Every structure is written in structure tokens, then in C-alpha cells.
Write an enzyme that holds these catalytic residues in place. Structure first.
Site, PDB file in Angstrom:
ATOM      1  N   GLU A 245     106.825  83.608  28.855  1.00 30.02           N
ATOM      2  CA  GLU A 245     108.062  84.292  28.947  1.00 30.02           C
ATOM      3  C   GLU A 245     108.833  83.959  27.693  1.00 30.02           C
ATOM      4  O   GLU A 245     109.928  83.828  27.636  1.00 30.02           O
ATOM      5  CB  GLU A 245     108.620  84.097  30.134  1.00 30.02           C
ATOM      6  CG  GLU A 245     109.553  85.252  30.745  1.00 30.02           C
ATOM      7  CD  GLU A 245     110.401  85.052  31.787  1.00 30.02           C
ATOM      8  OE1 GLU A 245     109.541  84.828  33.046  1.00 30.02           O
ATOM      9  OE2 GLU A 245     111.402  84.698  31.762  1.00 30.02           O
TER      10      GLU A 245
ATOM     11  N   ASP B  28     102.090  80.235  34.444  1.00 26.72           N
ATOM     12  CA  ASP B  28     103.129  80.771  35.235  1.00 26.72           C
ATOM     13  C   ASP B  28     102.270  81.967  36.132  1.00 26.72           C
ATOM     14  O   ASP B  28     102.039  83.088  35.561  1.00 26.72           O
ATOM     15  CB  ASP B  28     104.350  81.407  34.929  1.00 26.72           C
ATOM     16  CG  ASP B  28     105.149  81.971  35.859  1.00 26.72           C
ATOM     17  OD1 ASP B  28     104.821  82.223  37.013  1.00 26.72           O
ATOM     18  OD2 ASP B  28     106.312  82.353  35.634  1.00 26.72           O
TER      19      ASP B  28
ATOM     20  N   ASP C   8     103.821  77.355  38.524  1.00 27.83           N
ATOM     21  CA  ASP C   8     103.209  76.965  37.594  1.00 27.83           C
ATOM     22  C   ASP C   8     102.067  76.035  37.649  1.00 27.83           C
ATOM     23  O   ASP C   8     102.257  74.762  38.419  1.00 27.83           O
ATOM     24  CB  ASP C   8     104.163  76.161  36.393  1.00 27.83           C
ATOM     25  CG  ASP C   8     105.411  77.517  35.983  1.00 27.83           C
ATOM     26  OD1 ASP C   8     106.348  77.362  36.731  1.00 27.83           O
ATOM     27  OD2 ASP C   8     105.083  78.194  35.190  1.00 27.83           O
TER      28      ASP C   8
ATOM     29  N   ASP D 236     114.659  78.055  33.869  1.00 28.41           N
ATOM     30  CA  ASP D 236     114.602  77.945  35.159  1.00 28.41           C
ATOM     31  C   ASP D 236     113.394  77.584  35.843  1.00 28.41           C
ATOM     32  O   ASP D 236     113.254  77.255  37.002  1.00 28.41           O
ATOM     33  CB  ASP D 236     115.232  79.260  35.784  1.00 28.41           C
ATOM     34  CG  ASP D 236     114.352  80.447  35.447  1.00 28.41           C
ATOM     35  OD1 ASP D 236     113.461  80.238  34.533  1.00 28.41           O
ATOM     36  OD2 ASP D 236     114.512  81.620  36.044  1.00 28.41           O
ATOM     37  N   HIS D 237     112.402  77.317  34.919  1.00 32.89           N
ATOM     38  CA  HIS D 237     111.238  76.624  35.211  1.00 32.89           C
ATOM     39  C   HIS D 237     111.323  75.329  34.554  1.00 32.89           C
ATOM     40  O   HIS D 237     111.804  75.164  33.606  1.00 32.89           O
ATOM     41  CB  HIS D 237     110.008  77.210  34.772  1.00 32.89           C
ATOM     42  CG  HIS D 237     109.632  78.492  35.450  1.00 32.89           C
ATOM     43  ND1 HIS D 237     108.429  79.028  36.183  1.00 32.89           N
ATOM     44  CD2 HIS D 237     110.189  79.827  35.555  1.00 32.89           C
ATOM     45  CE1 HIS D 237     108.412  80.204  36.515  1.00 32.89           C
ATOM     46  NE2 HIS D 237     109.622  80.804  36.077  1.00 32.89           N
TER      47      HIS D 237
ATOM     48  N   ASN E 225     102.904  83.276  38.919  1.00 31.41           N
ATOM     49  CA  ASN E 225     103.602  84.060  39.620  1.00 31.41           C
ATOM     50  C   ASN E 225     103.209  84.133  41.113  1.00 31.41           C
ATOM     51  O   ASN E 225     103.321  85.090  41.930  1.00 31.41           O
ATOM     52  CB  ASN E 225     103.862  85.403  39.241  1.00 31.41           C
ATOM     53  CG  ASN E 225     105.145  85.513  38.192  1.00 31.41           C
ATOM     54  OD1 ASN E 225     106.169  84.983  38.820  1.00 31.41           O
ATOM     55  ND2 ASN E 225     105.172  86.122  37.103  1.00 31.41           N
TER      56      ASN E 225
ATOM     57  N   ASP F 194     111.691  80.990  29.787  1.00 30.89           N
ATOM     58  CA  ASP F 194     112.743  82.030  30.145  1.00 30.89           C
ATOM     59  C   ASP F 194     113.510  82.496  28.860  1.00 30.89           C
ATOM     60  O   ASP F 194     114.705  82.318  28.664  1.00 30.89           O
ATOM     61  CB  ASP F 194     113.661  81.448  31.170  1.00 30.89           C
ATOM     62  CG  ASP F 194     114.765  82.653  31.617  1.00 30.89           C
ATOM     63  OD1 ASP F 194     114.194  83.527  31.827  1.00 30.89           O
ATOM     64  OD2 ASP F 194     115.799  82.536  31.812  1.00 30.89           O
TER      65      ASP F 194
ATOM     66  N   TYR G 103     100.795  84.546  31.698  1.00 32.29           N
ATOM     67  CA  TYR G 103     102.112  84.932  32.317  1.00 32.29           C
ATOM     68  C   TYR G 103     101.727  86.217  33.194  1.00 32.29           C
ATOM     69  O   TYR G 103     101.527  87.121  32.861  1.00 32.29           O
ATOM     70  CB  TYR G 103     102.942  85.172  31.218  1.00 32.29           C
ATOM     71  CG  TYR G 103     104.291  85.691  31.812  1.00 32.29           C
ATOM     72  CD1 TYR G 103     105.102  84.859  32.986  1.00 32.29           C
ATOM     73  CD2 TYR G 103     105.043  86.618  31.384  1.00 32.29           C
ATOM     74  CE1 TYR G 103     106.148  85.243  33.485  1.00 32.29           C
ATOM     75  CE2 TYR G 103     106.295  87.130  31.924  1.00 32.29           C
ATOM     76  CZ  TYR G 103     106.890  86.571  32.965  1.00 32.29           C
ATOM     77  OH  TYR G 103     107.899  86.867  33.452  1.00 32.29           O
TER      78      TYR G 103
END
Ligand SMILES: [Mg+2]
Length: 282
Positions: free
Chosen positions: A60, A174, A247, A272-273, A176, A34, A135
Site C-alpha cells: 500500500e 497484507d 499480515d 495502521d499496520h 487482507n 498506509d 497486497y
């Protein structure tokens, strides 16, 4: 989030030997940070030093390749560092791969111009396997990017099938999407939200089938609920464990006998991950 209280999750101890007894020889950590600068300020590198992976994959980064924080020069055990950020040179998306040993070859993107402009993929080829970190593009607010996401999914799956035709593949990052209901706290309320659309879930199933790949964590822990890697910073979601598993480490079937463990580092702060960690006996 008004219907959820805390659901406990304690990641099992690290299993560092394979089913054949071979000690793990490779430790890979993956982390959506993040924002690379934000994460470094939040002591992410101190955590990495403690974890001591052989390879660290970051997503990210939100960081131009020409504006890397100098603190990354304090990682002597991860001295080979590769970065891909959006070609427009803006600070968003972005991935990195940091390795103890230099890979045989590093490449960026998936060999498709349409999909290679946002700094989303690094491919690192080693002696016995190829590592990809990704990502994956989010489907967006209002699902305005879902059409693009489905194009991406197809291009990416075809690209990975190609790689795997030559060498065993480890894909991390990630992705998503929360594949199945067990992969997020609130499946019922998210079926029309980015990360849990039927389109995205089936794209994930398509990726597993086509390449093919196995979901390392789910392979080992097929019935284990409340195991997540992302919680929104809002609504005190992390403290209640209202999360999503976004993830993954996905592996060629041929690597399954080398699989020692696939970890979720639930307590590691700084994004936040949370990080995930793979142990392989290669
Ligand atoms: Mg973020």
C-alpha cells in the site's frame, strides 16, 4: 468496539536459531505502510534502519513509480529497490521490495492481465528460494468487491503453486484476511465484513492446502491469542488491541526446518499496520 477493553499482547523474544541450531541467515521484514510518503514522514525509515532486515517488503505504497520519495536513497543496506504500482499511474495500492543483494530475477504481477493492473505483486527469485510480496485486493465496503476477490484468490493460488513447483516459496504481505477466529479481536461482529467473510477465510485455507504453504506465525504459536497486525485508526482501537492479523509470512513446507521465528513488531509506529519479521536459517 464498546464491548472490548484492552487485551495484552507481548511478542516473544526473537528466536534467532533454528530447531537444528543454525543461526538465522535471512531477516525479512514486511509492512503495509498506509502510504509511502505518509509513512516516511512518520519516521518509518528510522525504524527500518534499526530493524536492519536483509529484505524489506512494503505494501500500500499509494505511490506512482515515477514519484518515489528521495528519502529512499538513504537506505544503503537496501540498495536494490523494486516497485510496482497500478498501471493507470494513479497513487493507490502499490508494493515495493528492497533488498541488500540483487535477486536473480524480479517480476511483477501473477501472469494474468485481469489481475495485474493494480500494482499488487512483486516476485524476487534468489538462489535457494523465491520471495513473493503481495497486497491482496480488499473485499470492499458492502462486500462490493468480494466477487473479484474470489477470482483473485483463485488466480493467485494457481500462480503460487506454479512457483513452488520449481523452488521453495516465501509469501509475505497484507493478505487482507484474518484466517481464523483467533486472528481478530471481534470475530462475532465481523463475519459479514471485509477480511473475515467465510469466502475470504476459506480462500486462505485453500491457499495453504493447494500450494501448499504453512502460516509461519501460527505454526510457531498455534494457541496464542490477541496477536494482530492491523488496528483501525478510529475508536482508539490500537490502544485497546482491537485488531486483526492481516499480515503473514507463508512458507513452503520444505522451509519449516529453516524457520527460526516469525515476529509481530507491535510497538513500531507509522501506519495502521505494524511490521512483521521473519528469521530463516537458509
Ligand atoms: Mg491503508
Amino acid at each position: 468496539m464498546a464491548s472490548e477493553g484492552p487485551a495484552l499482547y507481548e511478542d516473544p523474544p526473537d528466536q534467532k536459531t533454528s530447531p537444528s541450531g543454525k543461526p538465522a541467515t535471512l531477516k525479512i521484514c514486511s509492512w503495509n505502510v498506509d502510504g509511502l510518503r505518509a509513512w516516511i514522514k512518520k519516521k518509518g525509515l528510522d525504524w527500518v534502519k534499526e530493524e536492519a532486515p536483509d529484505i524489506l517488503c512494503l505494501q500500500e505504497t499509494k505511490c506512482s513509480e515515477n514519484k518515489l520519495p528521495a528519502e529512499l536513497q538513504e537506505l544503503p543496506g537496501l540498495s536494490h529497490q523494486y516497485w510496482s504500482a497500478p498501471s493507470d499511474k494513479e497513487g493507490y495500492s502499490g508494493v515495493g521490495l528492497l533488498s541488500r543483494q540483487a535477486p536473480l530475477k524480479v517480476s511483477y504481477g501473477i501472469g494474468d492481465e485481469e489481475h495485474d493492473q493494480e500494482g499488487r505483486v512483486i516476485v524476487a527469485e534468489f538462489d535457494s528460494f523465491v520471495l513473493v510480496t503481495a497486497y491482496v485486493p480488499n473485499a470492499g465496503r458492502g462486500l462490493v468487491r468480494l466477487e473479484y476477490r474470489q477470482r483473485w484468490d483463485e488466480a493467485f493460488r494457481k500462480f503460487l503453486k506454479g512457483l513452488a513447483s520449481r523452488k521453495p516459496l516465501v509469501l509475505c504481505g497484507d493478505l487482507n484476511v484474518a484466517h481464523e477466529e483467533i486472528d481478530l479481536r471481534n470475530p462475532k461482529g465481523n463475519k459479514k465484513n471485509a477480511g473475515f467473510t467465510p469466502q475470504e477465510r476459506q480462500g486462505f485455507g485453500e491457499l495453504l492446502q493447494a500450494v501448499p504453504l504453512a502460516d509461519s506465525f501460527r505454526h510457531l504459536y498455534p494457541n496464542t491469542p490477541y496477536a494482530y497486525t492491523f488496528w483501525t485508526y478510529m475508536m482508539n482501537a490500537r490502544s485497546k488491541n482491537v485488531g486483526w492479523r492481516l499480515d503473514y509470512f507463508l512458507l513452503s513446507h520444505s522451509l519449516l526446518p529453516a524457520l527460526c521465528d516469525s515476529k509481530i513488531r507491535s510497538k513500531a509506529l507509522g501506519s495502521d499496520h505494524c511490521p512483521i519479521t521473519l528469521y530463516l536459517a537458509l
